Amino acid sequence: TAYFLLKLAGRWPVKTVHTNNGSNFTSTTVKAACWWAGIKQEFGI
Amino acid sequence: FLDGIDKAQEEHEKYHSNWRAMASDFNLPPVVAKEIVASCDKCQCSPGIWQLNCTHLEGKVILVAVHVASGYIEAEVIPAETGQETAYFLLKLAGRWPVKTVHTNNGSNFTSTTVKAACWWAGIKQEFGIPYNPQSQGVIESMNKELKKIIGQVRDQAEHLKTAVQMAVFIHNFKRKGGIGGYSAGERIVDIIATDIQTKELQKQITKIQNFRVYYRDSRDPVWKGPAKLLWKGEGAVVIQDNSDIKVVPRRKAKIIR
Amino acid sequence: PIVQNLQGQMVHQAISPRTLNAWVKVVEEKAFSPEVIPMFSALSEGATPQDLNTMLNTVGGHQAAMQMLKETINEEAAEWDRLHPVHAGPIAPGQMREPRGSDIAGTTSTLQEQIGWMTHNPPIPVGEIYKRWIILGLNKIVRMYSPTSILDIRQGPKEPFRDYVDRFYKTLRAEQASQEVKNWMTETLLVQNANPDCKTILKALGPGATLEEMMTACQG
Amino acid sequence: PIVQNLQGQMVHQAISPRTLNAWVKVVEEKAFSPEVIPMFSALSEGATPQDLNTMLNTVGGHQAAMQMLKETINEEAAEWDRLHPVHAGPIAPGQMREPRGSDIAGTTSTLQEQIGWMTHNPPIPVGEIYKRWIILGLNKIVRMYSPTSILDIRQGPKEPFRDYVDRFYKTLRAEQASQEVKNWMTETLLVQNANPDCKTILKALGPGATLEEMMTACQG
Amino acid sequence: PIVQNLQGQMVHQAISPRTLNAWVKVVEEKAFSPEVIPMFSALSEGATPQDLNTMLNTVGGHQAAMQMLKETINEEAAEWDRLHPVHAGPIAPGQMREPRGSDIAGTTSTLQEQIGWMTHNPPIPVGEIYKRWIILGLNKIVRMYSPTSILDIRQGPKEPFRDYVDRFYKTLRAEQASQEVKNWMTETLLVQNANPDCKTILKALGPGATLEEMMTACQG
Amino acid sequence: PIVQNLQGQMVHQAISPRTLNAWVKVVEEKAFSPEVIPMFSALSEGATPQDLNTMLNTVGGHQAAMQMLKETINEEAAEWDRLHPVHAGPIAPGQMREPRGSDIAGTTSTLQEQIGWMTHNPPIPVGEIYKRWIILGLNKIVRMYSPTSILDIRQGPKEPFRDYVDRFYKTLRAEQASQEVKNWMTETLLVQNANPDCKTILKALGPGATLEEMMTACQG
Amino acid sequence: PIVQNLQGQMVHQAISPRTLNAWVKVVEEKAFSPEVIPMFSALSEGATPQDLNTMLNTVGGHQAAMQMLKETINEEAAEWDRLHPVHAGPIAPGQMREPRGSDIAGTTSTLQEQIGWMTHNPPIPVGEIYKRWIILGLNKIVRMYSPTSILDIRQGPKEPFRDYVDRFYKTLRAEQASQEVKNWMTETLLVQNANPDCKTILKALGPGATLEEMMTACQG
Amino acid sequence: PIVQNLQGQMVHQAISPRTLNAWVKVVEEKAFSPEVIPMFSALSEGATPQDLNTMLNTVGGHQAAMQMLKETINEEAAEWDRLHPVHAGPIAPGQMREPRGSDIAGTTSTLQEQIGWMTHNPPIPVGEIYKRWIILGLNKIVRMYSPTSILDIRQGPKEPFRDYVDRFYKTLRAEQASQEVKNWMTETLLVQNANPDCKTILKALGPGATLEEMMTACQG
């Protein structure tokens, strides 16, 4: 999931992602990648 | 400067980009960007750089100089391939535009003693080889081939080669609108020179600042730390650097010693 | 190296280029880690001390390790010389005295001397002593190259415990200690740095709970 | 390893670097899939236990499985010691005494002792016992790394049955159970977890029909 | 595997890791196509049934094919048992009895039995029988793997006949039948299912024409 | 492949996997071109017809050419049968009759017959005849696979003469014709199918010359 | 190729695929650079003219150089035929007449003729003569394929002397002439075609100075 | 190279292509450094001067160093001619004559007389002398290719001590001098150019301190 997130960041500029409280979406790798890319996180849609 | 120093430090730790990029992105003086870049263990002026090229047309040699930051064009045909005429053109463009570094390519006429003396008199550092900018290599040749395309088109409506070439370069400089922004090359080059003047005013304002050893206090702690090098004072706060760390402290928590 | 022939006496041959190429490439691609300690031995069976030095000298970079192992080789040579005193007097024809501290390192001995010593009766395990000195040097160099201790490992707030215990064991192996210390740290340290849910599950399991039940309990 | 000489007798030899390099790379590259179990027996035939240990210690990472197999080897050695009493008394040369729980693993036995055991009459397949202990350790490692059980595989509404049966058998080979239970589950689950058309074809074919006719008739 | 020694008797040899790696990669990567059937006989010449079993079970994925092959091996073992009755009585001195159904598969016989059988006088080509059973399994699995038959292949009007005749030959060689039936197919269907323009051109040319003039007739 | 022992007899051996793997890889990546014709002759020295047919059947794709060469082999075998006197009746002890049409192709004759024929006194070069038949088949196949003729190639206005003459000789080498007409055509139209400037330069150089001068003048 | 036999009679040896693969890859990889001249002579030591022709025909593309070398081979074979007197008189069994111009090239001569010439006493250096002919052909090909002269190399004012001397020697080796002229040019053009500062430094150093002295002095 | 048969004699063999390929690729991919000195010495063991010069000439790039080492080879040949007396007059038949400066360089000695020199009684190690000449030339080349001197080494304010000591020892190895001055430098110079904190730390440590204590105390 973090790999796909960083790939889509590399292919398109994303500043905010809306996901649920899933473990995969909140995983350590995903959080590290999104904080490294400077992308804001919003949980709950 | 509204907490932009921390953002610049994070961006340089994650990317290690050019100092001017951080200065422009976060609206910061170049000094803090340079010191942030120097803080990086793995890391160590676009205006004023021109590129010169030679071409053959109608059995005659034409020399064209083009800027890198703005792409302003100057061109002239030379009756005979001699270093004296190239030196004359170099000194004329030095006396017409502010030139700091003349970049060229390999050439017998570029290595003449006359051009070396001319550039030494003007104090302009000259070199040839790989372009200084890692990008925009193709810009020079694309502009040259656009000029070559337009000179043949406008030749039929002119009586002399030199007049046609100068009219074509005038059209390219002024009467040819680009893409992003959509204005003349003269407008972008004058904007670049104006921003250079403003940055030099900022540089002299920083030159007004000097050693001015300053002690600082953080979070109302009973201890006073220092000394720290003064970087800037304004808006009721002072930004300083020490031990490769740059921070902004309110004036009420700092003292300045001459 | 020196290997046996087909129903014949031991003979010497040059080191195969494949072996040294594999050694140097695995040294350069992989940092100094415990797993290289046995591999080197598998690549140094029946090798003369001169061949060992030749293989050692081909390593590129990390010259601090080379200096450390050279110093340890020198000190072990001095220890061998002082414990086994240098006997004096002429040697009978057809025999040579025991290798010295400089002889085991190969700096003052030719290949012919190594061949004569290896096949001598009684056999002289000079190459084996040099190999064990290199093993001690590798142990201390992998102690040096380990950047983290074992008491400062903590599982993340929701990090999976699989790679956590994996790296815990990996760092534990690179630690020079005693068997009882290892038993104590594998009994106590791992449970004190785990996520609350399955760490309290482990505390419910009590002492002696082997890692299979602990990993099947911490699932999910 | 132990390789027979050209029209001669069995002689000891060291493990070739190519074989161990291929083994370690194929182990570390993809995963701990069950297919490592056969390939292991294709690379460790007629090999002394110390070479098995050398091949074992070269694994990069995955130390939890290493601890698992070490503990299982220790407990199996204890079981072997407790079931087989120690034969004391004077021991004739050439035919050494019974190996202990540490001698079978090779942690204390030397190369000469292992060669003597290999050449001892009656034969001592201690290396084979260690190999089968490693096989059991690999089986429980596969159990550790099994993604899921077999009791939850369901064919997709439009997924072709080929991939379904392929992954069903892939999971089945990793299961640990008796042969009769495996036959029962491969007879039942396949027909109970299929698409409506494939399962109606199956029930039209009736019981006792092998998978061949099943997946040649369910085609389309 | 099994290779005769120069100026000596046949001796057992360990399996080359490169051969196994090449076999498994070529099986897994390309396809289940007929051309792998001869390649198998290139990599299985003179090998014990255990070697064939190890080569077979090391493949990753396509476990349905492996199950089908195992079932066909079991049924061929039953066929061998029924055609050759189980001979009772004492074992002849130095002459082990003929392999049983479970013995040819190698699941119940140790390697020494096959080693003795291979060198026994008269020789027992049980490994060749197992290889032929594996060949039959490969033939049936490559038959079922073919997605299309030869009676329904049609040529599109908007592509050259090159790839059409190519795929026609692919499907022709992927089907198992008598040689005369294949000759009849390659004599009739090659022209009965072509593009109309090429069909009329070949009818004008008349029967009994080679494929070279057929392809050079209506190029483009 | 079958090989002769030094100062000894002729012993049959299996084809090494390296040769077959290299052959199949070079066939796959280097789709039929003239330079592949020598390659086969470099990889078939001292090989039995069974080995030739095995390495022939391992090819993947382009089976139309394979069927063409199979048909040419069959017709050449028929020609050999109808031309060479076919002997029957009694056969002298210790000798066997010459291989027939089916025997040279290897479809019916067993490997032992080929081994006996190769070591026979006088030896039978059946394998070499099969190899030359395959060579003729490959020649006609590469003639078929010609992208275009040789009299239609031209030189572009922005095309240097270097790659022009390169492709000219590449297409010319793919022509199966007499050497005299080849020399005649390579001396006249090689300039007639070029760019006018270097054409007139060569014409001013004189009608016909050494091509080194004609390429040095045409430089730039 | 022709390999000497251990205290016996030499016999023909098959060509290893490794040499062919390496030759073709190194030929296709970089260029027709002078470094291929020694490499070729390393891959064709003691090879028959048939082996040399087989190696020659393996190359792919760049057929113009092939035509150059074929024409040079033809002309030098004609020269050899015209200079060497034609053999006369009966040819005794076990001996053969002097190879023709076509036989040395290996186009028509068979391997048996080459073996007979090799075993003839005294041996005929036909292979060596053909190899040196190929060497001359490659030398002239490299001469053609050099897109620069020796007198046009210029050193930039800020260009380091390192790559200047490097390219100077590259062009010196690319140029073929007498050794005295090479010495004269490497002694004169080096100082005469440098930057003014290092030019005056070399003039101060005086004539006949070793290149190490000038390269150490020009630093900076 | 000259190799010994298994319980046989010394015979000549052709150079394996893989050895020279590995040599040239490791030369072209790795910049000149002292560690290439052992790598060259471990591959050319027991090699005739012909193999030495073929390996030397196949190197592509940095031909200035090649010319420098050729010049040093010529001067060493002159030294050999001038210090070792030239045995004037025709030596009696049956004994190989004294090798000349060109003979040791391999520029005039063919393989036959090289082998004769190898087998002469007493043995003439001309190959070893040429190898040591090449070693001296390569030492001079690596001295030339040293990026910087040793007295200008300075640890940066933010430069880690590990990298500083690694590069210090790298340049120390790159320095050509006696062992005594090497010890003096490694005992005095390194502490002088360190960061102030570790400088004061090492000053507190005092003399007679091993580098391990220094590196452990300098951390942080």
Ligand SMILES: O=P(O)(O)O[C@H]1[C@H](OP(=O)(O)O)[C@@H](OP(=O)(O)O)[C@H](OP(=O)(O)O)[C@@H](OP(=O)(O)O)[C@H]1OP(=O)(O)O
């Ligand atoms: O030289 P390359 O073209 O890269 O081919 C090599 C070479 O094999 P060959 O000499 O048969 O071509 C290697 O052999 P060494 O040079 O190490 O002696 C071999 O390594 P192994 O023989 O040890 O397996 C390696 O294989 P790999 O890339 O798997 O390490 C293989 O490469 P290719 O498999 O791509 O031909």
Ligand SMILES: O=P(O)(O)O[C@H]1[C@H](OP(=O)(O)O)[C@@H](OP(=O)(O)O)[C@H](OP(=O)(O)O)[C@@H](OP(=O)(O)O)[C@H]1OP(=O)(O)O
């Ligand atoms: O099997 P062959 O065709 O005779 O070639 C072998 C093979 O090398 P490749 O698999 O790369 O061809 C051997 O490797 P193994 O099969 O034993 O693993 C290798 O042995 P080493 O790995 O010890 O080098 C041996 O070389 P040697 O005869 O020097 O032992 C070499 O033979 P060639 O060198 O003649 O090709």
Ligand SMILES: [Zn+2]
């Ligand atoms: Zn940086």
